[PDB]
Amino acid sequence: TTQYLTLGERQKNVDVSMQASSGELSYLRGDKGIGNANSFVPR
Amino acid sequence: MKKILDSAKNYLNTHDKLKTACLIALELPSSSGSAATYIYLTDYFRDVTYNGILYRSGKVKSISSHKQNRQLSIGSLSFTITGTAEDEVLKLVQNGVSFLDRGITIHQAIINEEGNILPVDPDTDGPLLFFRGRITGGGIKDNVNTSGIGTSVITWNCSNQFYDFDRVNGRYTDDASHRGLEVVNGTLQPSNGAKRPEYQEDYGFFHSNKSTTILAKYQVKEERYKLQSKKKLFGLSRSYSLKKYYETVTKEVDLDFNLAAKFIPVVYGVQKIPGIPIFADTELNNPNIVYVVYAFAEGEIDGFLDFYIGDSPMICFDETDSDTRTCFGRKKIVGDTMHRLAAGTSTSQPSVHGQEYKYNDGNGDIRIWTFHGKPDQTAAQVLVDIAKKKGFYLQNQNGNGPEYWDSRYKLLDTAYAIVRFTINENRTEIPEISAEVQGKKVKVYNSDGTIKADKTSLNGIWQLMDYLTSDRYGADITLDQFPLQKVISEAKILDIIDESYQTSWQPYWRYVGWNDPLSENRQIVQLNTILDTSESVFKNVQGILESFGGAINNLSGEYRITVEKYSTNPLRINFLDTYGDLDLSDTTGRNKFNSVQASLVDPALSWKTNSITFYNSKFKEQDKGLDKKLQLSFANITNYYTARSYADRELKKSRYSRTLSFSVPYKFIGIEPNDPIAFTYERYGWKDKFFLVDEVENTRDGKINLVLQEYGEDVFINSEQVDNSGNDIPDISNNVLPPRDFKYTPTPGGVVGAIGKNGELSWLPSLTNNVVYYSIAHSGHVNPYIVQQLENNPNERMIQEIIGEPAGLAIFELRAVDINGRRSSPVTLSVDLNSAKNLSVVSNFRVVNTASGDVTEFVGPDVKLAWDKIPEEEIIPEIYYTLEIYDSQDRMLRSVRIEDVYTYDYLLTYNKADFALLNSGALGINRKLRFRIRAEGENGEQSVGWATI
Amino acid sequence: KDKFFLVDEVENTRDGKINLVLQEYGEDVFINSEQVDNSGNDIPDISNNVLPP
């Protein structure tokens, strides 16, 4: 039915030198998407 | 102790009136890193010229004193500048914050009777260096009395050479950092800055630092159609339902990969470290096959001892564990490594670089590729071959083609292992991977001159030397800043064989660094270190030093690494030679110690801490049973016996302790901390009493403040031994034969990281053996270019490249060194250098105000000069043009530098006032003019051919 | 010339002497205002070199 493979832990470090983005909110709340804290695509 | 020239000692003894001077060479800030300038100062009454550098005078008021003791700490020094000078008040007030972290060098120079500088330092026949470091903050104070005389004093606060240690220099798994891409200013493109020019083409850390948490859909093959594997008991009946054979069926797999970005550690000796996954994935069709690549260590390490799948290592510790979890081989006395699995190993050889290992524990299948770090290693062939077939799911989902994991993904200088897990119902997830690894290969400099860097070393001195000489992960210190002989002797001192225990007493010999079960593995100190590069280099160096009680100090520019040892050749100081003051104090009561808690990790129990306490019963009885624990560091020690010997030695050494403080004149210059002193004072009953220097302070007055430490009779690590002549005195070595073929070949088109590259200069190694490095002096540069030789140099000549210097003359001086310090005669090569980047000439160059009747006639009083913007401007960040004006009879009138504007406006008032008078002293006008312009970049970029009209 | 500071510490004495400890800050670091746009090009300048002997 459904199988999950897990590895690692999300990194909560944020670089405030670059402009703010919604990807940070998506990444910092455990949303499903592809990217890092400084650049996250939330699907 | 820092030896000085014999003539220096003779002059200091014979001459009573010393005319000292401090030659400050202060660094000056600039907007662009391609511009550098220095302001030179001195407190001498007249400007002092040294090495063609004019040290101005009249601004430095006073200098503080340099204090340094046996404990590694960031020393400080403050020198005042007269607050009445306008230059310095303006500089401090309006730029005193931009001066932070700017270098400064102060030389204690003795002025001869002929006004020359008496050669003291035997390394360069120059002044003895007094201080070096960087500024940290400033300050001014104007106290104006309404009646009398006010004062204005400018103060600068510096920090000694250990302020360069606070930097954290550890390779980061982030792709941008490793490839050195320019700091994202809204866009991301490569940049010059990088720890190696080759990294910029390495994409090993691509796909790392990211996260992929999606509900992916895999079209898993099999279990949709085709013949089933069921046969009904009834003979004729058959399962017409189709399944279990190849046909795609949808399957939702909720994969969640979070490849974090952690600093790669540096490991010396044998230690267990976790994995830092840098690329996770799974097959395109089968989710049950997952590829994960972990970055374990740094540099060119030896093989991996074993891999800890979850918590259970592949090889078991004992027979009991062997029956408990179906292990392979044993690691207690047999000491089997990973390489047992591949084939029967007579020796306990570690893993082989680029070799695959297959491991089955009854729960699944684990395939491991052990790639050791290397200076030049190719990409993972298996991963590249899979990528060419687009076998990775995430590759197809993202759309990447064969470039997903290309040949350019060679993980350079990183020891990584590829692990393939066959996910099954017994191993349902990815177990966090840890491995046992051998440390980075470390050079061991033999006293002969020959080196060997073919294995990892447990010696503390060599490990610290490796940490302090590597730019990639440690404090970048060039090898010319060490006394090689002294370091080698200290390394020998820490290799004294201990007789407390026998080799057969410690079972897990393989996993305590002992490469052999029979050879003499009992050294008095053995360190198995995990250098977490996240922490500051300062903290790492302190942690290494605390293991064996050593101490590092830099006075006079030489980095001394010394440990408390007994010496048979102390410096004889007599109380009369001392100033009047003396101070003997007793501190035994406070420093008495009789116990120590040792939290050391024991491989036998898996690498977990053992709370072990060492206490000397006799000391406790003497101390009335009171417990006195001394905080000792056992983090870097894994062999139990070495830890116990360390504990016993330290406890013994803390039972007798006194401090003797006095001041000795400038005759004894260069007295380093932790130095042997034979103090004689007959009224006390002392005859050459043995002391060890603790704190030494140098003052500008020449007074040296000393604080000595007294110890027991035979409490030193080196006690009850007699030093040999070979180690005590260096052997007689012939002067280094000068290097040959010292020639410079220009490079017409040159670029290294998108910056101008000039030619290259090459030479042949000196024929004299034991040469360690070739130092080259470049005119106009404070820092000579030093390139260390190699074991292969005896055949092939070495080459060094010079980049970014401006077109013009350069004087290059080449000379070598010996491990004993012996130096070849300098080799000179005076040549002219081409521009770093030959720039295009100015497109057009004309006068706007030109008469229509004829060309080359300006009618208006003011000449308007304009020209086109240079092409390829965007290639170079900052550029400027130099314009020169010449007279009819060829005398230059002005050289004007113009930046960011291409339309100069010559004025009549200029031509008369600033030019006619300056050229003849009388009012006049120049009618025939001449103009030439060049386009100059900053980093040694100069146009070719001038330009005129 | 009218450099901008902020009073950090003020002490009032019975004699009337008012001790002060001012604080200095970088440009446009306050909550109020920031430079709308940093310079996008080098600011031009005119400089004269040293005439060679």
Binary contact (A7, B254; C-beta < 8 A): no
User: What is the β-pairing status of strands B103-111 and B76-82?
Assistant: unpaired
**In whole angstroms, what is the distance from residue B898 CA to residue B936 CA?**
10
Binary contact (B254, A9; C-beta < 8 A): no
Residue B31 to residues B105, B595, B937, Cα–Cα distance (Å) = 22, 57, 15
Where do we find the tokens 């684990």? Answer: B366
Binary contact (C48, B894; C-beta < 8 A): yes
Longest dimension (CA), chain C: 66
Method: cryo-EM
**In whole angstroms, what is the distance from residue B560 CA to residue B670 CA?**
12
Residue B314 near residue B327, CB atoms below 8 Å? yes
Retrieve residue B512's tokens. 């305590």
- Chain B: closest CA distance from residue A2 (Å): 6
Q: How many other C-beta atoms are found inside a 10 Å radius of the C-beta of residue B102? A: 16
Query: Angle CA(B702)–CA(B706)–CA(B711) in degrees, nearest 5?
Result: 160
**In whole angstroms, what is the distance from residue B281 CA to residue A5 CA?**
10
**In whole angstroms, what is the distance from residue C30 CA to residue C40 CA?**
22
* Three-state SS annotation for B653-720: HCCCCEEEEEEECCCCCCCCCCCEEEEEEHHHCEEEEEEEEEEEEECCCCCEEEEEEECCCCCCCCCC
E strands, B366-505, in order: 366-371, 414-422, 433-438, 444-445, 451-452
Determine contact: B16 vs chain C, CB below 8 A.
Answer: no
Q: Of B887, B894, B899, which to mutate for an interface test with C (greatest number of C Cβ within 10 Å)?
A: B899
**In whole angstroms, what is the distance from residue A12 CA to residue B614 CA?**
42
Residue B164 to residues B74, B132, B478, B532, B630, Cα–Cα distance (Å) = 9, 10, 13, 18, 30
Determine contact: B901 vs chain C, CB below 8 A.
Answer: yes
- Distance spanning both ends of chain C, measured CA to CA: 39
Q: Tell which residue, B635, B302, B275, B274, has the closest CA to residue B442.
A: B302
Where do we find the tokens 């270019």? Answer: B785
Query: Angle CA(B24)–CA(B28)–CA(B30) in degrees, nearest 5?
Result: 170
Residue B522 near residue B503, CB atoms below 8 Å? yes
Point out the residue among C41, C45, C51 whose CB comes nearest to the CB of B895. Answer: C51
Compare all CA atoms of chain A with the CA of B261 and give the residue at the minimum distance. A11
The distance from CA B864 to its chain's CA centroid, rounded to whole angstroms, is 54
Retrieve residue B779's tokens. 């005119």
Task: Provide the 3-class DSSP secondary structure of residue B235.
Answer: coil
Task: Provide the 3-class DSSP secondary structure of residue B433.
Answer: strand
Q: Tell which residue, B205, B212, B200, B230, has the closest CA to residue B290.
A: B212
Residue C28 near residue C35, CB atoms below 8 Å? yes
Where do we find the tokens 């729960």? Answer: B363
Instruction: For CA atoms B820, B824, B826, B827, give the dihedral sign.
Output: negative
Residue B44 near residue B18, CB atoms below 8 Å? no
- Distance spanning both ends of chain B, measured CA to CA: 67
**In whole angstroms, what is the distance from residue B162 CA to residue A15 CA?**
29
Retrieve residue B568's tokens. 């048979």
Given resolution (angstroms): 4.3
Binary contact (C51, B899; C-beta < 8 A): no
Binary contact (A2, B258; C-beta < 8 A): no
**In whole angstroms, what is the distance from residue B55 CA to residue B86 CA?**
19
Residue B703 near residue B579, CB atoms below 8 Å? yes
Which residues face B153 on adjacent strands? Answer: B82, B141
Determine contact: C48 vs chain B, CB below 8 A.
Answer: yes
B247-270 as b/e: b if 16+ CB within 10 A = eeeebebebbbbbbbbbbbbbbbb
Radius of gyration of chain B (CA): 35
Determine contact: A34 vs chain B, CB below 8 A.
Answer: yes
Task: Provide the 3-class DSSP secondary structure of residue B484.
Answer: helix
Where do we find the tokens 């830099």? Answer: B554
DSSP conformation letters of B828-857: EEEEEE--SS-BPPPS-EEESS--SSSSS-
Element (H, E) at B547: helix B537-548
B881 exposure class (CB count in 10 Å sphere: 0-12, 13-18, 19+): buried
Query: Angle CA(B867)–CA(B873)–CA(B876) in degrees, nearest 5?
Result: 140
* Three-state SS annotation for B318-345: CHHHHHHHCCCCECCCCCCCHHHCCCCC
Which residues face B899 on adjacent strands? Answer: C45
B133: left (phi over 0), alpha (psi -120 to 50) or beta: left
Element (H, E) at B740: strand B740-745
**In whole angstroms, what is the distance from residue B861 CA to residue B512 CA?**
88
Binary contact (B901, C42; C-beta < 8 A): no
Q: Tell which residue, B734, B933, B920, B896, has the closest CA to residue B824.
A: B734
Query: Angle CA(B726)–CA(B564)–CA(B556) in degrees, nearest 5?
Result: 80
- Chain C: closest CA distance from residue B37 (Å): 16
Residue B133 to residues B82, B102, B129, B411, B558, Cα–Cα distance (Å) = 21, 8, 12, 36, 13
The distance from CA B617 to its chain's CA centroid, rounded to whole angstroms, is 45
Compare all CA atoms of chain C with the CA of B902 and give the residue at the minimum distance. C44
**In whole angstroms, what is the distance from residue B670 CA to residue B77 CA?**
18
**In whole angstroms, what is the distance from residue B179 CA to residue B206 CA?**
9
**In whole angstroms, what is the distance from residue B552 CA to residue B541 CA?**
9
Retrieve residue B446's tokens. 């033999």
Which residues face C51 on adjacent strands? Answer: none
**In whole angstroms, what is the distance from residue B775 CA to residue B707 CA?**
37
Point out the residue among C44, C50, C51 whose CB comes nearest to the CB of B900. Answer: C44
Residue B429 to residues B323, B362, B433, B772, Cα–Cα distance (Å) = 25, 15, 12, 52
Binary contact (C41, B900; C-beta < 8 A): yes
Residue B477 near residue B509, CB atoms below 8 Å? no
**In whole angstroms, what is the distance from residue B403 CA to residue B512 CA?**
42
User: What is the β-pairing status of strands B304-309 and B433-438?
Assistant: antiparallel
Q: Tell which residue, B295, B305, B405, B390, has the closest CA to residue B351.
A: B305
**In whole angstroms, what is the distance from residue B763 CA to residue B797 CA?**
6
Binary contact (B895, C49; C-beta < 8 A): yes
Measured in residues, chain A has a length of 43
**In whole angstroms, what is the distance from residue B562 CA to residue B560 CA?**
6
B723 exposure class (CB count in 10 Å sphere: 0-12, 13-18, 19+): middle
**In whole angstroms, what is the distance from residue B926 CA to residue B80 CA?**
50
Q: How many other C-beta atoms are found inside a 10 Å radius of the C-beta of residue B280? A: 24
Residue B136 near residue B160, CB atoms below 8 Å? no
- Chain B: closest CA distance from residue C6 (Å): 17
Q: How many other C-beta atoms are found inside a 10 Å radius of the C-beta of residue B637? A: 28
Which residues face B829 on adjacent strands? Answer: B812
Residue B714 to residues B171, B632, B652, B719, Cα–Cα distance (Å) = 44, 21, 10, 5
**In whole angstroms, what is the distance from residue B28 CA to residue B24 CA?**
12
Residue B72 near residue B545, CB atoms below 8 Å? yes
B186: left (phi over 0), alpha (psi -120 to 50) or beta: left
DSSP state for residue B553 in the 8-state scheme: E
Determine contact: C51 vs chain B, CB below 8 A.
Answer: yes
Residue B61 near residue B75, CB atoms below 8 Å? no
Q: Tell which residue, B589, B578, B542, B533, has the closest CA to residue B561.
A: B542
Residue B835 near residue B756, CB atoms below 8 Å? yes
Binary contact (A7, B258; C-beta < 8 A): yes
Binary contact (B892, C43; C-beta < 8 A): no
Which residues face B696 on adjacent strands? Answer: B68, B706
Residue B839's contacts (CB-CB under 8 Å, 6 or more residues apart) are: B870, B872, B876, B879, B935, B936, B937, B941, B942, B943, B944
Residue B37, amino acid: T
Instruction: For CA atoms B648, B649, B650, B651, give the dihedral sign.
Output: positive
Residue B893 to residues B21, B536, B882, B901, B919, Cα–Cα distance (Å) = 41, 56, 13, 21, 8
Residue B899 to residues A28, B15, B879, C50, Cα–Cα distance (Å) = 47, 56, 7, 17
Q: How many other C-beta atoms are found inside a 10 Å radius of the C-beta of residue B761? A: 22
Binary contact (B901, C44; C-beta < 8 A): yes
Give all strands of the β-sheet with B740-745 in edge-to-edge order: B740-745, B760-764, B798-801
Q: What are phi and psi of B277, to 5 degrees?
A: -55, 135
Q: How many other C-beta atoms are found inside a 10 Å radius of the C-beta of residue C9? A: 9
- Residues in chain C within 8 Å Cβ distance of B900: 41-45
**In whole angstroms, what is the distance from residue B432 CA to residue B419 CA?**
11
